[PDB]
Design a protein around this motif. Structure first.
Motif, PDB file in Angstrom:
ATOM      1  N   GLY A  69       0.808  -1.100   0.176  1.00  0.00           N
ATOM      2  CA  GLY A  69       0.049   0.123  -0.040  1.00  0.00           C
ATOM      3  C   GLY A  69       0.927   1.198   0.075  1.00  0.00           C
ATOM      4  O   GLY A  69       0.267   2.486   0.004  1.00  0.00           O
ATOM      5  N   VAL A  70       2.035   1.016  -0.320  1.00  0.00           N
ATOM      6  CA  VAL A  70       2.907   2.231  -0.039  1.00  0.00           C
ATOM      7  C   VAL A  70       3.685   2.418  -1.449  1.00  0.00           C
ATOM      8  O   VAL A  70       3.895   1.625  -2.026  1.00  0.00           O
ATOM      9  CB  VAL A  70       4.167   1.978   0.882  1.00  0.00           C
ATOM     10  N   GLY A  71       3.641   4.040  -2.030  1.00  0.00           N
ATOM     11  CA  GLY A  71       4.295   4.069  -2.954  1.00  0.00           C
ATOM     12  C   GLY A  71       5.074   5.479  -2.919  1.00  0.00           C
ATOM     13  O   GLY A  71       4.556   6.554  -2.208  1.00  0.00           O
ATOM     14  N   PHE A  72       6.044   5.822  -3.638  1.00  0.00           N
ATOM     15  CA  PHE A  72       6.666   7.073  -3.898  1.00  0.00           C
ATOM     16  C   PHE A  72       5.717   7.985  -4.964  1.00  0.00           C
ATOM     17  O   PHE A  72       5.176   7.490  -5.865  1.00  0.00           O
ATOM     18  CB  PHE A  72       7.916   6.940  -4.344  1.00  0.00           C
ATOM     19  N   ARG A  73       5.791   9.026  -4.564  1.00  0.00           N
ATOM     20  CA  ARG A  73       4.774  10.250  -5.437  1.00  0.00           C
ATOM     21  C   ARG A  73       5.648  10.886  -6.567  1.00  0.00           C
ATOM     22  O   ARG A  73       6.536  11.548  -5.797  1.00  0.00           O
ATOM     23  CB  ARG A  73       3.987  11.071  -4.565  1.00  0.00           C
ATOM     24  N   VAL A  74       5.434  10.842  -7.665  1.00  0.00           N
ATOM     25  CA  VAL A  74       6.382  11.328  -8.771  1.00  0.00           C
ATOM     26  C   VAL A  74       5.387  12.102  -9.518  1.00  0.00           C
ATOM     27  O   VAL A  74       4.305  11.894  -9.430  1.00  0.00           O
ATOM     28  CB  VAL A  74       7.283  10.485  -9.441  1.00  0.00           C
ATOM     29  N   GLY A  75       5.991  12.999 -10.349  1.00  0.00           N
ATOM     30  CA  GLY A  75       5.314  13.778 -11.301  1.00  0.00           C
ATOM     31  C   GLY A  75       4.252  14.706 -10.551  1.00  0.00           C
ATOM     32  O   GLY A  75       4.457  14.908  -9.327  1.00  0.00           O
ATOM     33  N   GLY A  76       3.404  15.381 -11.303  1.00  0.00           N
ATOM     34  CA  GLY A  76       2.490  16.336 -10.903  1.00  0.00           C
ATOM     35  C   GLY A  76       3.065  17.682 -10.458  1.00  0.00           C
ATOM     36  O   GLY A  76       4.256  18.056 -11.070  1.00  0.00           O
ATOM     37  N   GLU A  77       2.627  18.123  -9.202  1.00  0.00           N
ATOM     38  CA  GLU A  77       3.063  19.592  -9.314  1.00  0.00           C
ATOM     39  C   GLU A  77       4.234  19.678  -8.467  1.00  0.00           C
ATOM     40  O   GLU A  77       5.120  20.286  -8.658  1.00  0.00           O
ATOM     41  CB  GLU A  77       1.737  20.365  -8.629  1.00  0.00           C
ATOM     42  N   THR A  78       4.434  18.725  -7.290  1.00  0.00           N
ATOM     43  CA  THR A  78       5.355  18.486  -6.375  1.00  0.00           C
ATOM     44  C   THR A  78       6.355  17.476  -6.418  1.00  0.00           C
ATOM     45  O   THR A  78       7.372  17.443  -6.047  1.00  0.00           O
ATOM     46  CB  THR A  78       4.900  18.455  -4.979  1.00  0.00           C
ATOM     47  N   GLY A  79       6.088  16.431  -7.387  1.00  0.00           N
ATOM     48  CA  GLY A  79       6.844  15.156  -7.629  1.00  0.00           C
ATOM     49  C   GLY A  79       7.970  15.312  -8.622  1.00  0.00           C
ATOM     50  O   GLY A  79       7.854  15.994  -9.420  1.00  0.00           O
TER      51      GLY A  79
END
Ligand code: CU
Ligand code: CU
Length: 303
Positions: A104-114
């Motif tokens: 259930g754990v992921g790193f957040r990339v992309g978008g506005e802050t990733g």
């Protein structure tokens, strides 16, 4: 034959991040390459599969950043990895195998802050004399999903900037401490980093005067991510504390830490998605007097 992006189903894709056929020419060579995210929206890194040449490749690091140091097909990592902050996401070491991301754990990339890019570092150890002709495509495949993950992985970086090693002093401590004042984070792995003079690096959560070990390791052993047996919850009002122990024995001049030396502790955590921060850092020693009563364990060496 695998394309750089492989759609997996309606929501997920794999990125294959591989050296573009490189030829290390000396033992002890670091190569770096970049891979932009193919999506502009937020995505979540939820798994990694190493693809390392099992003779020559000693370790691999994968980072997320927005400015890779080079725009070329590959470069030497002496040149840098990213010119902006390089957020470590993954380590692999040949004789210290990675542990999976918790479910259930992921790193957040992309978008506005990733991060918009991944940077892969591949470290080639000792080389046979006779492989001047040899192309290598070592790297990592990365599982990404556009499905929001309940828990968001991040990195809490503790770094020492203040300390110096007077030559011939056998033991020097570098202490780091900050109060924590965000929503809860749960620490599930750590990595230590110094140069040749590091003997041991330990990380602790301190709560109402009680120290709980996050992890401790000799920074001369494989600098992969070691699992934390039971994740350590760190909450508002806790202090994080770290100690690097250095030697100056056989040196002939002061060594500044933070840099002929470095004391870095990378604390990998997850947070509930709605409160999550991808990155936090401590570069100070806010409660130095607290270290007079650090656990004796912090000073015990590791081979
Ligand atoms: Cu290595
Ligand atoms: Cu360093």
């Amino acid at each position: 034959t695998i394309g750089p992006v492989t759609p997996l189903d309606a929501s997920d894709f794999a990125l294959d991040i591989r050296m573009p056929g490189v030829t290390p020419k000396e033992s002890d060579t670091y190569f770096c390459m970049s891979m932009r995210l193919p999506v502009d929206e937020e995505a979540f890194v939820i798994d990694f599969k190493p693809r390392a040449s099992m003779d020559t490749v000693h370790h691999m690091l994968l980072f997320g950043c927005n400015m890779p140091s080079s725009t070329g097909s590959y470069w030497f990592c002496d040149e840098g990895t990213c010119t902006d902050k390089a957020n470590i996401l993954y380590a692999w070491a040949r004789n210290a195998p990675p542990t999976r991301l918790p479910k259930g754990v992921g790193f957040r990339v992309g978008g506005e802050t990733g991060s918009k890019y991944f940077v892969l570092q591949v470290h080639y150890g000792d080389i046979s004399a006779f492989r001047d002709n040899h192309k290598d495509c070592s790297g990592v495949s990365v599982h990404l999903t556009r499905v929001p993950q309940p828990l968001i992985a991040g990195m809490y970086l503790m770094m020492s900037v203040d300390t110096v090693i007077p030559p011939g002093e056998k033991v020097v401590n570098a202490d780091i401490s900050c109060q924590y004042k965000m929503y809860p984070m749960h620490v599930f792995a750590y990595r230590v980093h110094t140069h040749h003079l590091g003997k041991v690096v330990s990380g602790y959560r301190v709560r109402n005067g009680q120290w709980t070990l996050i992890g401790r390791q000799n920074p001369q052993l494989p600098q992969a991510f070691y699992p934390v047996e039971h994740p350590v919850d760190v909450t508002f009002g806790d202090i994080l504390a770290a100690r690097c122990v250095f030697t100056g024995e056989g040196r002939t001049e002061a060594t500044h830490i933070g840099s002929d030396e470095m004391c870095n502790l990378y604390i990998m955590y997850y947070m509930e998605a709605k409160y999550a921060l991808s990155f936090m850092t401590c570069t100070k020693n806010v409660a130095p007097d607290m270290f007079r009563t650090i656990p004796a364990e912090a000073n015990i060496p590791i081979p």
